[PDB]
């Protein structure tokens, strides 16, 4: 239905331990497809999904050149902002960016973004209208000034409306057999007795994609969430995800409880019991 391509930049200074490290990862939906680490023996943009490997030499030349220029650029950013804030020469500082685009079921632009963050906090972002900036503070407004005076917004719009969407559509095609396909969760229930009076019922959802999922417990068909123990959804490492949900129940009342699971890959909701 609806798809997204996003890039994630991170620069981290390390005073008296070398120049700031720069790291990038590209994503389509919940699928990482490209990566870059400036601390690699030979810093290249590298493929992390089958359907980009096929890209020609000229592509990787371009991508790597952008990553190398990014690390230079962001290092300047770190230095400039350090001055605005007039900070001590002591510890580390970070500069992050997240940008990309969403396209609807119709394959047309839905909304574009290009956010920057200094030390884990919003610093400056491109408004959804793609011609203005939101500065989070005194410093960021100085940045805002320079970017408006240089016509940076227009350039961003050009990439976001055109280039960014084009690529996304291209990736959707070339890797359709996995990107366009949803994997249903593989559900089960485990039985972990605490004592002769209480036992834990944990409800597992495994090997699913994408990560958007819903788990819940019911008693006699009625909810009871403030009681349930979750874990955040975690990757299995194979491009699928895991998650469980437990409730502590009275030894003997296990029949009362059912686990309920909804996922994009299910034709219809599922109900498990112990």
């Amino acid at each position: 239905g609806s798809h997204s391509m996003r890039y994630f930049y991170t620069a981290v200074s390390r005073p008296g331990r070398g120049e700031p490290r720069f790291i990038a990862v590209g994503y389509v939906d919940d699928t990482q497809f490209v990566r870059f680490d400036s601390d690699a023996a030979s810093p290249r943009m590298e493929p992390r999904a089958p359907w980009v490997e096929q890209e020609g030499p000229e592509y990787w030349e371009r991508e790597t050149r952008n990553m190398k220029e990014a690390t230079q650029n962001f290092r300047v950013g770190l230095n400039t902002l350090h001055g605005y804030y007039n900070q001590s020469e002591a510890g580390s500082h970070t500069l992050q960016r997240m940008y990309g685009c969403d396209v609807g079921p119709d394959g047309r632009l839905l909304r574009g973004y290009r956010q920057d963050a200094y030390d884990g906090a919003d610093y400056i972002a491109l408004n959804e209208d793609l011609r203005s900036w939101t500065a989070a503070d005194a410093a960021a407004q100085i940045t805002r000034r320079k970017r408006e005076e240089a016509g940076v917004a227009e350039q961003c719009r050009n990439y976001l409306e055109g280039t960014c969407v084009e690529w996304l559509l291209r990736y959707l095609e070339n890797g359709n057999e996995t990107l366009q396909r949803a994997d249903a969760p593989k559900t089960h229930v485990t039985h972990h007795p605490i004592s002769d009076h209480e036992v834990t019922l944990r409800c597992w959802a495994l090997g699913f994609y994408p990560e958007e999922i819903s788990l819940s417990w019911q008693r006699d068909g009625e909810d009871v969430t403030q009681d349930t123990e979750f874990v955040e959804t975690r990757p299995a490492g194979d491009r699928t995800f895991q998650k469980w949900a437990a409730v502590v129940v009275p030894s003997g009342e296990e029949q009362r409880y059912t686990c309920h699971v909804q996922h994009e890959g299910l034709a219809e909701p599922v109900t498990l019991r112990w």
Partner: peptide, 12 residues
Amino acid sequence: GSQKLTTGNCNW
């Protein structure tokens, strides 16, 4: 497709 740098010597 990553975004090309951005001209202007004025990014930060």
